[PDB]
Amino acid sequence: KCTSDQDEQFIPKGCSK
């Protein structure tokens, strides 16, 4: 997943996959 709660300025290692 990309957004855990609401992460608009932050994208993780594993966003769109």
From Swiss-Prot:
List locations, semicolon-separated.
Fimbrium; Membrane
Q: List the disulfide bonds.
A: C2-C15
Q: What superkingdom does the record give? A: Bacteria
Subunit and interaction comment: The pili are polar flexible filaments of about 5.4 nanometers diameter and 2.5 micrometers average length; they consist of only a single polypeptide chain arranged in a helical configuration of five subunits per turn in the assembled pilus.
Which family does the UniProt entry place this protein in? Belongs to the N-Me-Phe pilin family.
Could you tell me what this protein is called? Answer: Fimbrial protein
The organism is Pseudomonas aeruginosa
User: Where is the organism placed in the taxonomic lineage, from the top?
Assistant: Bacteria, Pseudomonadati, Pseudomonadota, Gammaproteobacteria, Pseudomonadales
Report which gene this protein is encoded by.
Answer: pilA
Question: What portion of the full-length protein is represented by this chain?
Answer: 134 to 150 of 150
